[PDB]
Design a protein around this ligand. Structure first.
Ligand SMILES: OC[C@H]1O[C@H](O[C@H]2[C@H](O)[C@@H](O)[C@@H](O[C@H]3[C@H](O)[C@@H](O)[C@@H](O)O[C@@H]3CO)O[C@@H]2CO)[C@H](O)[C@@H](O)[C@@H]1O
Ligand SMILES: OC[C@H]1O[C@H](O[C@H]2[C@H](O)[C@@H](O)[C@@H](O[C@H]3[C@H](O)[C@@H](O)[C@@H](O)O[C@@H]3CO)O[C@@H]2CO)[C@H](O)[C@@H](O)[C@@H]1O
Ligand SMILES: *Cc1c(COP(=O)(O)O)cnc(C)c1O
Ligand SMILES: *Cc1c(COP(=O)(O)O)cnc(C)c1O
Lengths: 824, 824
């Protein structure tokens, strides 16, 4: 009935309905008879993109006129998730859009479910990046992100009888309605080739392969602001003229299209397998391609703002932030662009580069810092190796000529490790030496960087090193994912200003004992639990009881994350439930356990752990004697959407990594913000959460990070004494109770005292008893409903500090020296 | 200045200007700073596509409600050219769009020049297809075309010092604003695999590769009607799930993506080189892909129109027309879809197939009819070979049962040639045996098919064979490419109804001697010649004199087309001009010779001819003693756009193929319609043109088709006597006058009496003298300006018969049994 009428600025139900129908008809991607939910999604998204374009454009023009110092965030991952709910929310158009879609015959919820997540990231590195973008927008900061437009993500995880199987993502196999292609924004990116030395001493990278980098903008709208910034993504492309027709017409199709194939490879998947030289080269190509395209674009915008400019202004007008060591090549690439393409001398280009770049480190373990073969780097990126060797020459000369106390450490401090067997470039060393600031992501992590990992560098530059505690946006992670709870918070604080000033949540503490609030709290959590139930049934086929305790663990599958401990706990609780009399079973607290996460495909034990969880669920969930008191579900394809479904409905979440292994952990912060209590080790963000929410609202257990090496040494000296419940759990897994899959090889990782891959290095067995004791505390606290709801309210009430708004403001002031630039 | 305001139905300058700016802003493909000619082009096209969508939709719905019999035209080529001018013209929005672009700061002409031709075809087969689509739309016929969405055409021709070089077309490297993707219209297409026999006797093609066939519609608007039909184009695609991640992550990138690569190959170029087994298989895959995707879509639309349907209705509701033998596989594919996917028995599916399919043949030479190795067919399309062998078994049984006088000819009449040395499938035989109608494309061609090529088949089915003389649309080829001449015609006929009733042009004959008309005619031709001069200067750098005689030959470069005869004529003319006294040179008619066309890349002598034309021009054009009387220019990258520039400005065109070699030739018709006289052999469309325009208005020469074999035999018997002027032309080319390129090997094709590639089989030497005598007649006729202009007017006046509207109306009534279905 509703007729097409374009209105790019539609802000009421009737105008918005007209604009959606306009796109359906005049921006078609389907046959015109079809107006199903999927077609309704694309039309709605295109209706919203109209407003996004207006704002993006206004923002671009304003930043152009003002010529503020601008920050560019370089990341190999962005976990954008779905864009619909967030776009509608930040434009504060919820009611009008929900009403428009109703007049067109749909519930907004159903349409929202059609959207595929943007497969542009994998883990916490990427979701941090995504949260940061939302906060940069909302704080009106002149800042952008750059990334790669990956076609297939890491992988879509499916769960079969074999356990995890890995299939390419398909989010772009029709189209993304959010992105805007910029066919004028193309930069050449080189690979391989060699260095031409000119008579005047200048140098030029020549020959090799040249790919085209094409820009796509993804608009990022701020909450309660016109300010709309960009996640500018690159697509690697060959030109038509790069296809060799002679070869094609001889039947040599692969040779004919070899440039197109190498360009496609760059944006196929994140973290392509790098056991072989091909893979190592591919990963390096992706990092270089990000770096080179992004820096060419940045330099081009710097010049475009010239009202007449001097290169001395560059580090007063540009900040480049490296998320982890993946964008390390920005350092030598910026030197290359300055000196070769722009004529600067080494000293002037170094002064610019060292004042522009900053490095954020996300790791405790020095073994985990990136290193590349010097031969591979010479092959792919000869001119950059020239620049890197010069950076290292100068640095080492300075240590030799000023720090004689460090002479014996030059072999570890240098960027180039000239080990006779496997000479490498130490990318973290390149980052620390070159960057004006280096930061960690939690206080303890940052102290560990200063005191252990980079101590000799701290000695050289005692003001280089800073902390910036991670955070999460309360838009995506509370306001938009839990609207009913958000309405309760607004009502009781008598303001909605908490959405941009999350510290206002402490105003809930005075009401934590108030039974009317506890009632409304409980109703909210229950609603979310029924929605979650529905979802889990939909996607795993298992019915789950929403009056049961929802216990959730969702992280990357990995021995140090200790999913294996959780699952052995479940196996023990199952066994005891089975042995109990039915009269005794009625005393226990019913529980639905939910584990999810992806396993790196080639990581054998991680894949065995996923298989184990599923085999355990298959048995427990189908056992009519205890399945009223316990169910276990492996939740597949964990991504932002899945987190948006689980987090609002969560009651207990598990953050149980071996102490000392986690720098941070932002999912912890999401769960705490949503009233979900944590069972956790004293590690990463758990430390700060427990501080802010109060130790009485947190379930702590396990060895502490300083005990861990002592306890490993006790194991090696044969002094470990396994708890009987742990031994019984193990045996039961080895009993055959969970089918014909031999779990013996997985569990052998927990056996013995010595050997790589043996001796329970992650202290599954040692922590097990305090872990089970904590789970007993959870049960007892759960049975006291009023006490539970009080703890849940305090958890939300104490979450203010974890806002990514706080984090980004600190970066803005202390590292980038940028400020708000609100679009009028 | 002008503000964005969407108006899909914009019909005046101000509304249209707003809609263009609306697309520029809200359908962006560029950074928002840029509004150059290219960006203007895209925005203007999108503005027009708005109107095209409305009409396409209205048309689709109307055909759906009516359930008329509908024709589907299958072609491996469409020469669509540029769409802008044609779209504006058919919507009769010329004035409003030219004014809109002027208010936005542009001339429509400049915007028009930004458009890349759709590289979807190569030659006359494809432009015929494109003309037919325009006439289907204009005559309100329920008819569509199906084609492949080729990414890179055949090739873009560049001319370098080496002559022709071939580069991939790039029309899709940003996007095409005309097409509409239909993500719900996807069909599976199989290759290789094997045939499963089921216990119930049914058979199923299984295994092998499976690609996805995705539809894109290109709207084809009719002149003076709402009726807008489709050229539906297929893209071959792999699914994301077809990428093998294990292999990708092992560094085996080619293996990982091998399905994606085989899908991409299908739509890379037209006519991929087929000397090797790979290429033969790729060409077959392209034909099968077209056929299978198209027929699945047709069957799906047949069912979608059901009001309740019976299969007996299918051939009353569907006609499939095969343009040449490339869609031969529609016959067995339609039997496969009917019997396997839809459950029909052989006899019912054959009755349906034989009444649905018809075949248009375009060939005089039996050596030219497509044949494929039986083994290759078995490998790629096993189920189709099963069906083909059954068709052939039954047909041969029919000859035994009913036409025992043909028993001895079964080995030539059968579809399967079981020659022990080279067993093949004869695709033409399959087409003739299966189709209810077979037609040729000119009266003489059709008589040759009945009397020689398929005589025994005519004997079996004496009503199968028909003629349908080709034609051209007077919209693209007169009304839109020559607006000024069109305005003169309208003024003198006192009507513009000729645009859809081209036989009205005979009303110009009474005026062919009228001095005022001749004056206006000349003025019109002169304006077109100056535009052509500009263009030639732009695209070759050669400055040409528009008061000279413009002599044009534009066809595929080939020894039988006899560009080599033309160029040797030019070389002789140049030599005589140089030898003349300047007093004598002033007696001659100045001439600009223009040759163009593409050479197949591996066809050595064709490429040598392109080089020769360029080397001759380089010398003549830069010779200040005769370049006032002669210039020669090779016009590069001949395509629809180039013909749109040359044809309106042409005075003489050359259609000089060896007699008996051409079935038709539509470019002949386009020239005749535009008042350009023809120097030509008695062959192809020249026969009918000369009849219609009058023998006094045509320059005929050369051997006739009945003489050709006798003359070839005389050459073999050593009785040929070369004309001295021919010999002198040859020698001068061998003199070194045209640079260091040795033309000896090229000319060796004209030497000797026997040998493949030798002995002047195309009668260049024999026809040369009557050719030079005709060119002499042209010069004399040119000097009599009134007599020339009378002949030019008579040429246009007699061109009515060559309308594609006549051609399609005949197909509609006599072959498809479809009728007008005007959209209200
Ligand atoms: O302003 C001085 C100078 O700076 C730049 O030269 C640097 C090169 O760009 C860089 O490769 C490196 O040069 C070394 C070569 O790699 C090596 O092969 C050998 O020749 O030693 C060189 C010096 O150590 O370092 C220099 C400068 O230190 C810029 O390219 C010059 O144009 C510019 O004049
Ligand atoms: O008419 C009913 C019957 O028709 C269809 O069968 C045909 C097959 O589809 C077709 O291939 C061909 O089959 C021959 C096989 O190719 C070959 O192996 C040979 O040895 O024997 C077969 C029979 O000639 O011909 C038959 C029809 O003559 C349809 O698929 C059947 O299900 C249906 O029963
Ligand atoms: C927040 C989030 C993460 C990061 O969580 P960690 O605690 O570091 O494991 C990862 N994936 C998704 C989908 C997230 O939403
Ligand atoms: C009309 C046309 C053709 C068909 O020409 P023939 O005379 O059949 O060779 C080929 N190419 C182009 C660009 C045309 O416009």
């Amino acid at each position: 009935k509703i007729s097409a009428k374009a209105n790019p600025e539609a802000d009421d139900a009737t105008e918005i309905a007209g604009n959606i129908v306009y796109h359906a008809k005049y921006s078609p991607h389907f046959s015109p008879l079809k107006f199903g939910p999927e077609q309704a999604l694309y039309a709605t998204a295109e209706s919203l993109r109209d407003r996004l374009i207006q704002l993006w454009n206004e923002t671009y023009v304003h930043f152009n006129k003002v010529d503020p110092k601008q920050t560019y965030y370089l990341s190999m991952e962005y976990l954008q998730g779905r864009a619909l709910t967030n776009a509608i929310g930040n434009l504060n158009l919820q009611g009008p859009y929900a009403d428009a879609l109703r007049t067109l015959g749909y519930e907004l919820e159903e349409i929202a479910e059609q959207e595929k997540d943007a497969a542009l990231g994998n883990g916490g590195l990427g979701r941090l990046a995504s949260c940061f973008l939302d906060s940069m927008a909302t704080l009106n900061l002149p800042a952008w992100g750059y990334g790669l437009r990956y076609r297939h993500g890491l992988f879509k995880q499916i769960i079969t009888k074999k356990g995890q199987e890995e299939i390419p993502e398909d989010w772009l196999e029709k189209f993304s309605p959010w992105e805007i292609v910029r066919h004028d924004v193309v930069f050449p990116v080189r690979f391989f080739g060699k260095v031409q030395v000119n008579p005047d001493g200048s140098r030029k990278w020549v020959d090799g392969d040249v790919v085209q980098a094409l820009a796509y903008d993804v608009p990022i709208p701020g909450y309660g602001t016109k300010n709309t910034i960009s996640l500018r993504l690159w697509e690697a492309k060959a030109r038509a003229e790069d296809l060799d027709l002679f070869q094609f017409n001889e039947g040599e199709y692969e040779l004919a299209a070899q440039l197109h194939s190498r360009a496609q490879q760059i944006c196929t998947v994140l973290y392509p397998g790098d056991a072989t030289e091909n893979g190592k080269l591919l990963r390096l190509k992706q990092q270089f391609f990000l770096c080179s395209a992004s820096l060419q674009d940045i330099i081009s915008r710097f010049h475009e703002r010239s009202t007449t400019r001097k290169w001395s202004e560059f580090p007063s007008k540009v900040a480049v932030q490296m998320n982890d060591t993946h964008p390390t090549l920005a350092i030598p690439e910026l030197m290359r662009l300055l000196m070769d393409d722009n004529g600067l001398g080494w000293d002037e280009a170094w002064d610019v580069t060292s004042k522009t770049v900053a490095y954020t480190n996300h790791t405790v373990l020095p073994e985990a810092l990136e290193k590349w073969s010097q031969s591979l780097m010479w092959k792919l990126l000869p001119r950059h190796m020239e620049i890197i060797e010069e950076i290292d020459k100068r640095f080492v000369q300075t240590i030799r000529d000023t720090r004689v106390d460090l002479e014996d450490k030059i072999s570890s401090l240098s960027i180039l490790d000239n080990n006779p067997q496997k000479p490498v470039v130490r990318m973290a060393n390149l980052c620390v030496v070159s960057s004006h600031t280096v930061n960690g992501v939690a206080q303890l992590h940052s102290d560990i960087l200063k005191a252990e990992l980079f101590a000799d560098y701290v000695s050289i530059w005692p003001n280089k090193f800073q902390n910036k505690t991670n955070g999460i946006t309360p838009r995506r992670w509370l306001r938009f994912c839990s609207p009913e709870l958000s309405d309760i918070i607004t009502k009781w604080l008598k303001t909605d200003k908490w959405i941009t000033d999350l510290d206002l949540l402490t105003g809930l503490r005075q009401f934590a004992d108030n039974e009317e609030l506890q009632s409304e709290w409980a109703s909210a959590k229950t609603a979310n639990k029924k929605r979650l139930a529905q979802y889990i049934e939909r996607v795993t086929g298992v019915s789950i009881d929403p009056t049961s305790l929802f216990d959730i663990q969702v992280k990357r599958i990995h021995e140090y994350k200790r999913q294996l401990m959780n699952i052995l706990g479940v196996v023990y609780r199952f066994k005891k439930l089975k042995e109990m009399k039915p009269e005794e079973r009625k005393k226990t607290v019913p529980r639905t356990v939910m584990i999810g996460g992806k396993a790196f495909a080639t990581y054998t034990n991680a894949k065995r752990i996923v298989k184990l969880v599923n085999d355990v669920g298959d048995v427990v969930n189908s056992d009519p004697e205890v399945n009223e008191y316990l169910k276990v579900v492996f939740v597949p394809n964990y991504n932002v959407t899945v987190a948006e479904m689980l987090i609002p409905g969560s009651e207990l979440s598990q953050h149980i990594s071996t102490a000392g292994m986690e720098a941070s952990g932002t999912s912890n912060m999401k769960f705490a913000l949503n009233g979900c209590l944590i069972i956790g080790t004293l590690d990463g963000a758990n430390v700060e959460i427990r501080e802010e929410v109060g130790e009485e609202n947190f379930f702590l257990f396990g060895a502490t990070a300083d005990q861990v090496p002592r306890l490993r040494k006790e194991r090696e000296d044969g002094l470990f004494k396994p708890d009987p419940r742990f031994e019984e759990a193990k045996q039961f897994v080895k009993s055959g109770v969970f089918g014909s899959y031999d779990y013996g090889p997985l569990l052998d990782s927990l056996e013995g005292n010595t050997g790589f891959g043996r001796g329970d290095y992650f202290l599954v067995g040692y922590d097990f008893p305090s872990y089970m004791d904590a789970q007993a505390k959870v049960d007892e606290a759960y049975k006291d409903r009023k006490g539970w709801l009080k703890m849940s309210i305090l958890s939300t009430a104490g979450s203010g500090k974890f806002s990514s708004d706080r984090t980004i403001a600190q970066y803005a002031k202390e590292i980038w020296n940028i400020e708000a630039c609100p679009v009028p």
